[PDB]
Write a protein that binds this ligand. Structure first.
Ligand SMILES: *[C@@H]1O[C@H](CO[C@@H]2O[C@@H](C)[C@@H](O)[C@@H](O)[C@@H]2O)[C@@H](O[C@@H]2O[C@H](CO)[C@@H](O)[C@H](O)[C@H]2NC(C)=O)[C@H](O)[C@H]1NC(C)=O
Ligand code: NAG
Ligand code: CL
Ligand code: CL
Ligand code: CL
Ligand code: CL
Ligand code: CL
Lengths: 217, 220, 197, 213, 214
């Protein structure tokens, strides 16, 4: 068959240029047309354009013509999508997808390239406790992972020991340009006395690992 | 350009029952040379690229289970899952490849249908450590509710808050088939210290009346 | 159990001029299309309306194999929705074209020291061709207001012109051999298939 | 094997019409280019009409434009030439032919069929013996017929050695005349019987003639 | 039109000789030139397509060459069966045009005619017309002279003749001359004679009959 492999994650400042790639490997690549698809976070799929590497015939969607350049190196079976000056509104995940002809379904997809455009710089999160209320059959507590860039962070409770009732929520982009999320565990454990509840957060982009114990105030 | 409209936007059906998604095109998509409609259906699960389910309106791609079937003609097309299984929960798109520019439908989210369940609401005041910085976050938590539609409102001294809170919802749990939401109210430390009663009001079908969880600044 | 005669088309000793393009209707046979898309000898392989990777699973009522020679820069003209002297005056594909345009450089076969001038194209025509239409007329083209009465002269041009294929030509002016495969399914038994069809 | 069988020719009044057909076998009538080429008696080859295997484009010589129409019937695998407003100059043997290339190259030809345009009436021939006198020679005089052709065999096809059937000459009366001679051993005269078979299809006359000394 | 001119218009050549026929086109027709052979009473047969390609079933004795405006057909070893008319035909485009043909006759030894005379049958005289038939059998070359004389009176204007095409085996010709008279004119005179002149004969040979014998 055919496989498409895309380039890695990108984290860029506004105004910077960018070129992401997509490589084919398999039988009969000469028959293949490579198109680009944009998916903004929580949104659907937007077709951007398509190219035939054999002669570099390129067609753009009218929504995207003038905004990007789609190209291809036929000596390495690779198609490219590039901008000259990124905006924060270019933040999305971009898929390449192949079909063995024009007016053909997209039967092969790359794994996607995540592109984050932002004026923020790398910053590790600050972790704050979500202390359980003293009132409380079942109680609830958690950790607030605030002000970190870029994504992602990982959260574990008591070092992977507690997994039932855990809900780590999707991150949220704050108007500051920094991300924030919360992880919450429903411990019906009346306990709250040497029951031990610590959250471990890892922000690999900043080499930030932080443990914090969530105790009743 | 050819435009595609899917209906419904969301769909909940029980395990083993039939799910039906519809796609309407602004123009016919038929090649008279071979008498085929150039319409495809893709499935996308979170964190993954789309996967081609059906092409030429009704042909299944290699390895696609028989539960999925494509139907329709002219400008009316239908994807049908004859008996949903847990691995079918996802967003399904139709797409026309009759001619460029290729266009997609808006997508249809398919979730497992469940009995209505009321959310367990909790309120969390800001930590004293965060208040040392100069910003305060109050967190409201709605735990294990179905359906997903739920409204939270922040009331600070019974004044409604707008534009200073953000929400986040988990994905449907693989076991309970419920959702969970977290809402964060972000205030400056000064404005936080100008008021006393902080309240989260939750409205949901599982609740006969809105449940308000509240605390008072500076009380044990 | 009859093998489709695609080899006669792709491996012919000499190809047709584009104005007199060749056409062979193919049916009642089995074809292994992979022999085409598993190949590394083709320079372009542009399919429209059908996936060549799915042809071995399909049957059609007819497959048309047209073939001819053009120069390199004109290979892109062999496609739906193209404008130019080849698409307009020599070989024209319909908007709903369903098939594959397969082309390769043939400079070693069709060029010659001293020049091969045996490949011709139509340069002038009063109107554009319809899809899959051929024109082998040689009437004098009236370019201006003066009638010609079948004699060459001022504003009275012979409509056919030669490619000058010398081996030293730039790649855009070198000869390329082109095969066009059209697939059609009428209200009739579909008798040309792949092995799995 | 490819075969093209023609029919439809014959005598027609000036200004009349006639349709020639060319039934093909061994290939599909519309897969390859087809044409009609004619030959007036004793003259060269003149291309008349053509139809291609692409968009069924048709072509006609100026000498027949507006009067002839070439067509095919796929269900009958047959080619047709409809000829209207015929003139004397249209009198010719008409051939259908196939071209395997878009550049016209006729690799298969029909046997041909004779089209005669004249006001003259059909008449059957009178067959007389050309008796041998006393290697010898004897013949048959096929005189005063119209139009062409006639066929002459000897002894129902067995005797084909030393046989010369001469081309017909148009007489002053406008009727054709012809003779068919055969050279045979002189001693074989008394033992053998000699019969000349004259067939004139246009008038539907068959005459078997005994030529005895 | 694209005019095609062949050269020569006719030719004689002995068995085994090499025969060369040329064809010129008023315009450049590249390699789109075809050669046909046509034998008496038969459809033309394609010998050469695309200037130099030999058709299936045609012997390699025939070959073709040329390009542009000038073309040549070659018969390497002329055989008696090759007696025919050979045509070129451009295939560059419409209208299709042929050359005027080249008549190829086989040169043979000089063969003198065998002369026979046939008096009118009785049936024809009953019909009221007399036809005397003189036969010149298996001669070469084709030029002959037939002279009808009735009572040693030189006839003129009352005779027709036709010649068979050259024989595909022995390369000879045959000629029939018919003298047509009214039945009355036939019963008037007595001596009917046919005088034949040919290169194979030392002197003209005469075959005669007296009206009403055996
Ligand atoms: C067209 O020809 C190629 C190559 O022709 C080969 O060499 C010639 C001299 C002659 O001997 C042919 O019979 C040979 O096949 C064909 O490609 C080859 O196909 C065979 C069998 O599939 C394969 O083993 C070879 O590796 C191929 N060689 C290549 C690709 O260079 C081809 O199949 C012929 N037909 C078509 C439709 O292309
Ligand atoms: C094409 O290339 C390789 C050669 O084995 C293989 O993976 C594939 O099946 C081939 N297909 C054909 C039909 O040769
Ligand atoms: Cl044009
Ligand atoms: Cl030019
Ligand atoms: Cl037209
Ligand atoms: Cl036409
Ligand atoms: Cl010579």
């Amino acid at each position: 068959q055919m496989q498409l492999v895309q380039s890695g994650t990108e984290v860029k400042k506004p105004g910077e240029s960018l070129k992401i790639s997509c490589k084919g490997s398999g039988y009969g690549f000469i028959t293949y047309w490579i198109g680009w698809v944009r998916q903004m976070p929580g949104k659907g799929l937007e077709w951007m354009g398509i190219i035939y590497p054999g002669d570099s015939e390129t067609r753009y969607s009218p929504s995207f013509q003038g905004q990007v350049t789609i190209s291809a190196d036929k000596s390495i079976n690779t198609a490219y999508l590039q901008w000259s000056s990124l905006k924060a509104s270019d933040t999305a995940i971009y898929y390449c997808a192949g079909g063995s002809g024009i007016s053909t379904p997209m039967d092969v997809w790359g794994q996607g390239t995540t592109v984050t455009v932002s004026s923020a710089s790398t910053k590790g999160p600050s972790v704050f406790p979500l202390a359980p209320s003293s009132k409380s059959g079942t109680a609830a507590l958690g950790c607030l992972v605030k002000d970190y860039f870029p994504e992602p962070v990982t959260v574990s409770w008591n070092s992977g020991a507690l997994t039932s009732g855990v809900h780590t929520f999707p991150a949220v982009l704050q108007s500051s340009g920094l991300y924030s999320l919360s992880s919450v565990v429903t411990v019906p454990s009346s306990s709250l006395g040497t029951q031990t509840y610590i959250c471990n957060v890892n922000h690999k982009p900043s080499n930030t690992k932080v443990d914090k114990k969530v105790e009743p105030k | 350009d050819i435009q595609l409209t899917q209906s419904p936007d969301s769909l909940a059906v029980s395990l083993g029952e039939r799910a039906t998604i519809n796609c309407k095109s602004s123009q016919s998509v038929l090649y008279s040379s071979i008498n085929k409609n150039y319409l495809a259906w893709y499935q996308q699960k979170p964190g993954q690229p789309p996967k081609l389910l059906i092409y030429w309106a009704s042909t299944r791609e290699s390895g696609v289970p028989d539960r999925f079937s494509g139907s329709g003609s002219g400008t009316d097309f239908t994807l049908t899952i004859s008996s949903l299984q847990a691995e079918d929960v996802a967003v399904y798109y139709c797409q026309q490849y009759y001619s460029t520019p290729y266009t997609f439908g808006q997508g249809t989210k398919v979730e497992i249908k469940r009995t209505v369940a009321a959310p367990s609401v909790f309120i969390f005041p800001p930590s004293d450590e965060q208040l040392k910085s100069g910003t305060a976050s109050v967190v409201c938590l709605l735990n294990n509710f179905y359906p997903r539609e739920a409204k939270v409102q922040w009331k600070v001294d019974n004044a409604l808050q707008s534009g200073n809170s953000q929400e986040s919802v988990t994905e449907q749990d693989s076991k309970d088939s419920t959702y969970s939401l977290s809402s964060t109210l972000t205030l400056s430390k000064a404005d936080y210290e100008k008021h006393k009663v902080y309240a989260c009001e939750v409205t949901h079908q599982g609740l006969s009346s809105p449940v308000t969880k509240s605390f008072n600044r500076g009380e044990c | 159990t009859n093998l489709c005669p695609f080899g006669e088309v792709f491996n012919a000793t000499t190809f047709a001029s584009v104005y007199a393009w060749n056409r062979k209707r193919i049916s009642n046979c089995v074809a292994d299309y992979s022999v085409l898309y598993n190949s590394t000898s083709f320079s372009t392989f542009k399919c429209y309306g059908v996936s060549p990777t799915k042809l071995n699973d399909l049957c059609f009522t007819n497959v048309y194999a047209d073939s001819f020679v053009v120069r390199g820069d004109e290979v892109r003209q062999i496609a739906p929705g193209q404008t130019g002297r080849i698409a307009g005056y020599n070989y024209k594909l319909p908007d709903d074209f369903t098939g594959c345009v397969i082309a390769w450089n043939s400079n070693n076969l069709d060029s010659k020291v001293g020049g091969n001038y045996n490949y011709l194209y139509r340069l002038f025509r009063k109107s554009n061709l319809k899809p899959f239409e051929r024109d082998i007329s040689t009437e004098i083209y009236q370019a201006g207001s003066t009638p010609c009465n079948g004699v060459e002269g001022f504003n009275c041009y012979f409509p056919l012109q030669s490619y000058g294929f010398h081996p030293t030509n730039g790649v855009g002016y070198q000869p390329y051999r082109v095969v066009v495969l059209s697939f059609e399914l009428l209200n009739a038994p579909a008798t040309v298939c792949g092995p799995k069809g």
